[PDB]
Design a protein around this nucleic acid. Structure first.
Ligand SMILES: *[C@@H]1O[C@H](CO)[C@@H](O[C@@H]2O[C@H](CO)[C@@H](O)[C@H](O)[C@H]2NC(C)=O)[C@H](O)[C@H]1NC(C)=O
Length: 250
DNA sequence: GGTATAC
DNA sequence: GGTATACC
């Protein structure tokens, strides 16, 4: 089971409109069984619909999705979009959890893996308030545990956990980090941006031993579509300034 | 300070 | 067509 969290810079009607960009986006999503897409600025699900038309042109049940409402304090809004292969997994529940874009949490049943039921917390943090936000994920964690009696939780997204947004000294005041409950599959040494900058913005965190035991070592990593598709830096950036981070459960 | 979008 | 962001 392959899972990915992908921040697609301003996914919307414009981006999905360009048959080329769309082609690539589609190709990327298809690698996965469950993919979280962030930075969905689609008031009307017009772009999300385009995507699903492509994904499901050969069959209408290749992919189902769960999308959250537009999240944001003022006029700027983003949605959390969960795309999934209905034949490998099913939603058992979902809920909207201090945060700019409050985490959307989804619960999945997985028949084909060691771990059977697990939750995914999605987070696209605010750059300027990343520290506060990654730390609050500790609360969300506790929240999920209380509600669902579930220990197996994968927390992933464009957490902005590096460079200017989370410094070396700042990591100590982040509970999701200091707690040995959590294993950070994407190290601070990974490069997850398509730009020149070398930062580990996108991450995947896992709690619970069933899950932790279901992760295939050496499987979690950024997915550099530039290199994989021998795309030009300009083409690459046109798709997104971030790379998908992925993992494989067994 | 810049770039960029949605709406 | 100004406002509200995500980055550099
Ligand atoms: C799909 O978007 C791409 C990427 O931005 C477009 O290709 C860019 O087009 C501009 C304007 O012609 C160029 O100056 C760039 O060189 C292009 N990039 C590549 C890497 O070819 C493309 O124009 C898109 N299309 C639709 C039909 O309008």
């Amino acid at each position: 089971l392959k899972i990915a969290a992908f921040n697609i810079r301003t996914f919307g009607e414009t981006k999905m409109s360009n048959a080329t960009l769309a082609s690539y986006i589609v190709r990327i999503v298809r690698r996965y069984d469950i993919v979280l897409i962030q930075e969905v600025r689609d008031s009307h699900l017009v772009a999300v619909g385009k995507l699903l038309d492509y994904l499901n042109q050969d069959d209408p049940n290749t992919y189902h999705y769960v999308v959250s409402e537009p999240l944001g304090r003022n006029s700027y809004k983003e949605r959390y979009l969960f795309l999934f292969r209905p034949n490998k997994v099913s939603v058992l529940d979902t809920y909207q959890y201090s945060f700019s874009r409050e985490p959307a949490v989804v619960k999945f049943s997985s028949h084909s893996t060691k771990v059977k039921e697990f939750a995914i917390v999605a987070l696209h943090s605010a750059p300027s308030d990343a520290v506060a936000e990654i730390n609050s994920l500790y609360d969300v964690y506790l929240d999920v545990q209380q509600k669902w009696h579930l220990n197996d939780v994968m927390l992933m997204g464009d957490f902005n956990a590096d460079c200017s947004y989370v410094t070396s000294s700042q990591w100590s005041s982040i509970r999701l980090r200091t707690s040995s409950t959590f294993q950070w599959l994407i190290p601070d040494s990974a490069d997850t941006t398509a730009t020149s900058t070398n930062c580990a913005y996108d991450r995947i965190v896992v709690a619970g031993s069933l899950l932790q035991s279901s992760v295939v070592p050496g499987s979690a990593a950024p997915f550099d579509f530039q290199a994989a598709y021998g795309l030009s830096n300009e083409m690459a950036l046109a798709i997104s300034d971030h790379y998908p981070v992925e993992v494989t459960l067994t």
